[PDB]
Write a protein that binds this ligand. Structure first.
Ligand SMILES: *[C@@H]1O[C@H](CO)[C@@H](O)[C@H](O)[C@H]1NC(C)=O
Ligand SMILES: *[C@@H]1O[C@H](CO)[C@@H](O)[C@H](O)[C@H]1NC(C)=O
Ligand SMILES: *[C@@H]1O[C@H](CO)[C@@H](O)[C@H](O)[C@H]1NC(C)=O
Lengths: 33, 50
């Protein structure tokens, strides 16, 4: 995941969590209900 | 469960690039509605004719 220096960790999906969603998607889904 | 298409893992490295060597002309079709059937309704003959 070395794309020259850009860190896409906040937009790439996280395989550790059971729901494969980005860290931003978690906040987007945990605030709209 | 419906499939979301094929699964292709493109190789990404800092030194490799993919350059196309040939091409193709694709003639696709796209349909778009423009107008509809203009309808004129008679009030009296529809509500109570004769
Ligand atoms: C990407 O950003 C996160 C949050 O700042 C950080 O924890 C992580 O170490 C960064 N990763 C890289 C490749 O620097
Ligand atoms: C490409 O990135 C990888 C991961 O940082 C690194 O190990 C490798 O040496 C890099 N190659 C070049 C050509 O910089
Ligand atoms: C390019 O593709 C066509 C078929 O679409 C083929 O006839 C032609 O030989 C190819 N040319 C090259 C540059 O390989």
């Amino acid at each position: 995941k070395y794309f020259g220096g850009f860190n896409f960790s906040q937009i790439l999906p996280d395989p550790s969590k059971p729901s494969k969603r980005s860290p931003i998607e978690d906040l987007l889904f945990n605030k709209v209900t | 469960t419906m499939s979301l298409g094929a699964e292709n893992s493109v190789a990404y490295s800092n030194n490799s690039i993919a350059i196309p060597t040939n091409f193709t002309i694709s003639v696709t079709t796209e349909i778009l509605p423009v107008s509809m059937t203009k309808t004129s309704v008679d009030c009296t003959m529809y509500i109570c004719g004769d």
